[PDB]
């Protein structure tokens, strides 16, 4: 049912976000969590980009 | 559907840098008593760098609570306090400097202390027209969309003409405003100009540099 959808869609990253938000003790935990999720997707794409650039530089050398 | 609108006054430095204000609210809850009872809530409002004037921050669920209706939101409208130097005009600042006439013609350097703790010295690049202006790019308020780019500082020039001039000063001004081009000058003209310049910049009896009494 719907709980399976919620789980296998958000839960894995949401648990890490909650652990990060509770370790740091911010002043606005909800906003902290939202910005954390945005930075999460952004850092995934940028680490892919970083791997690509490193490989390209090695090949050119 | 009534809401309580409150001005929120900020200084240009706060809006430039991005403040984090804690405001107080006096909220009234109606009871059976003839008079009301009120409490002070604290609200954290986070103004981002260079938000446009007139920005509305709405707190939903905060406001005077009548017995039957859930209270409507409370609105804070951002407005800037007057500044001694700058006035913001959209995304860039405006500085209105009064300029001497000889600074306009001959040219000098205006001195301006920016909102950031950096001083600024801007040359006068030509004969400043009356009602003209100068523009220094990248020296305005930050762009609310992108937190790196900024506007351009705008100097609006209002000339300060001299109040008194003697007849010999007027003679000198007319000789300056009608001097022939340097390829049309006689040898007498060049010798006279050299003599006058050596006399006006005389190190002990010339008036090129004097000390104020």
């Amino acid at each position: 049912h719907d709980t399976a959808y919620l789980k296998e869609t958000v839960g894995e990253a949401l648990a890490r976000g909650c652990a990060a938000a509770i370790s740091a003790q911010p002043n606005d935990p909800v906003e902290y969590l939202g910005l954390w999720l945005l930075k999460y997707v952004k850092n995934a794409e940028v680490e892919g980009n970083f791997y690509r650039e490193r490989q390209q530089d090695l090949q050119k050398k | 559907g009534k809401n309580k609108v409150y001005p929120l006054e900020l200084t240009l430095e706060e809006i430039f840098h991005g403040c984090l204000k804690k405001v107080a609210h006096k909220r009234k809850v109606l009871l059976f008593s003839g008079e009301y009872v009120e409490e002070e809530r604290q609200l954290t409002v986070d103004v981002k760098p260079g938000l446009p004037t007139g920005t509305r921050f709405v707190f939903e669920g905060e406001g005077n609570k009548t017995p039957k209706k859930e209270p409507g939101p409370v609105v804070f409208v951002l407005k800037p306090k007057p500044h001694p130097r700058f006035v913001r005009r959209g995304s860039d600042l405006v500085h209105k400097v009064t300029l001497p006439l000889h600074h306009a013609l001959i040219g000098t350097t205006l001195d301006i202390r920016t909102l950031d703790d950096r001083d600024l010295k801007v040359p006068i690049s030509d004969i400043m027209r009356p009602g003209s202006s100068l523009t220094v790019p990248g020296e305005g308020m930050p762009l609310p969309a992108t937190p790196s780019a900024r506007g351009n500082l705008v100097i609006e020039i209002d000339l300060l003409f001299p109040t008194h001039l003697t007849e010999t000063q007027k003679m000198l001004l007319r000789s300056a405003f009608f001097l022939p081009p340097p390829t049309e000058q006689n040898e007498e003209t060049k010798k006279a100009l050299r003599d006058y310049e050596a006399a006006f910049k005389h190190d002990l009896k010339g008036w090129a540099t004097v000390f104020k009494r």
């Binding site: 049912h1 719907d2 399976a4 959808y5 | -």
Partner: protein, 163 residues
């Protein structure tokens, strides 16, 4: 780059038309997987059950063929992302309450704003000939209480262009 599948419509030994459909195998994958598994094994002789004039052409029951629910499986609700705004939007149908979807499918014949967020839409018609075939199927000679009086049947059904 999606998958494609086609089937024929025939009324009383008279070929009424054929239709080809694209399946949104990038939006709602599991629904497409179930639909192709049932069009490979099933839908071969299942009547067109419910036909609303300016609404949708519905049908595709398996064990009964006349509009009552079937046992053996229940399909969960995948996604409300495809919006019913243009004709020829294939989707699955279920009871009022979600997570009871069955082989019953429906193809829209007009903009259907209300259905958005209530029914899983996971496909589309491909060309104008198929859409005109459905629009012509609307005005059958006689159809009694939203069912064609003769049996308008899927004679053939097959999958083309993809695994």
């Amino acid at each position: 780059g999606r998958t494609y599948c086609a089937f024929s419509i025939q009324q009383s030994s008279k070929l009424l038309g054929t239709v080809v459909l694209e399946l949104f195998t990038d939006i709602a994958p599991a629904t497409c997987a179930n639909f192709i598994k049932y069009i490979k094994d099933g839908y071969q002789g299942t009547p067109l059950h419910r036909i609303v004039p300016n609404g949708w052409v519905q049908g595709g029951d398996i064990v009964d063929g006349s509009g009552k629910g079937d046992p053996g499986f229940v399909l969960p609700d995948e996604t409300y992302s495809v919006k019913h705004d243009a004709p020829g939007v294939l989707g699955m149908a279920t009871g009022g309450q979600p997570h009871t979807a069955n082989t019953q499918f429906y193809i829209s014949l007009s903009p259907l704003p209300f259905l958005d967020g209530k029914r899983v839409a996971f496909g589309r018609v491909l060309n104008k000939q198929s859409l005109e075939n459905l629009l012509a199927l609307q005005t059958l000679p006689t159809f009694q209480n939203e069912r064609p009086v003769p049996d308008v049947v899927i004679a053939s059904c097959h999958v083309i262009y993809n695994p």
